[PDB]
Design a protein around this ligand. Structure first.
Ligand SMILES: Cc1c(C(=O)O)c(-c2cccc(N3CCN(c4ccc(NS(=O)(=O)c5ccc(N[C@H](CCN(C)C)CSc6ccccc6)c([N+](=O)[O-])c5)cc4)CC3)c2)c(-c2ccc(Cl)cc2)n1C
Ligand SMILES: [Zn+2]
Ligand SMILES: [Zn+2]
Ligand SMILES: [Zn+2]
Ligand SMILES: [Zn+2]
Length: 150
């Protein structure tokens, strides 16, 4: 409880849909307090790209991500991102990484990867990040911290 929560799937699809919309795409092209969390994540991901733009490179070539890639390859990269533990900034970097991997996959004519990356992100969020998030005050704590720094 939970095996795979709908709220974790929704957070991921809403974030990825936003990043793909910024590149002119609809989520439907790739796949078949809550509003405040969605908006804070959108804003934090946009700020993360302005501050750490150099990291937004040819991710699918650097990580050899193809239509043959399975979940454990994605988990190894994200475990590197969280190698020294979890914090809010690293969670924003994780969402941003998934968004950039989706955008790059579409650019490299590997549209098939988008729904897969969404599922891998929702799995990692559910299994390896939600326990930390709940222990550290929940998503409404992030909304408060982000909004107050803003
Ligand atoms: C393996 C691996 C990687 C790897 O190993 O590192 C990386 C990788 C690559 C580059 C960068 C990073 N980062 C950079 C940042 N960093 C960090 C910094 C500070 C804190 N401290 S904090 O928690 O107190 C804090 C402080 C401030 C704010 N926010 C204010 C809002 C102000 N505003 C309201 C005015 C500022 S904006 C903002 C600032 C920082 C983070 C978010 C938003 C927030 N916050 O959450 O908003 C939280 C904690 C963590 C963690 C890692 C990872 C990738 C990767 C590859 C490609 C792509 Cl595309 C993505 C990822 N990969 C794959
Ligand atoms: Zn939603
Ligand atoms: Zn961008
Ligand atoms: Zn795992
Ligand atoms: Zn913990």
């Amino acid at each position: 409880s939970e095996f795979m929560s709908q709220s974790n799937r929704e957070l991921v699809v809403d974030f990825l849909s936003y990043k793909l919309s910024q590149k002119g795409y609809s989520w439907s092209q790739f796949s078949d307090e809550s509003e405040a969390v969605k908006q804070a994540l959108r804003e934090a991901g946009d700020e993360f790209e302005l501050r750490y733009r150099r990291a937004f490179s040819d991710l699918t070539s650097q990580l050899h991500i193809t239509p043959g890639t399975a979940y454990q390859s994605f988990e190894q990269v994200v475990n590197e991102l969280f190698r020294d533990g979890v914090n809010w900034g690293r969670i924003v970097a994780f969402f941003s990484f998934g968004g950039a991997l989706c955008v790059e996959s579409v650019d490299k004519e590997m549209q098939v990867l988008v729904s897969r990356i969404a599922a891998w992100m929702a799995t990692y969020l559910n299994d390896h990040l939600e326990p930390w998030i709940q222990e550290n005050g929940g998503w409404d704590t992030f909304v408060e911290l982000y909004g107050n720094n803003a």
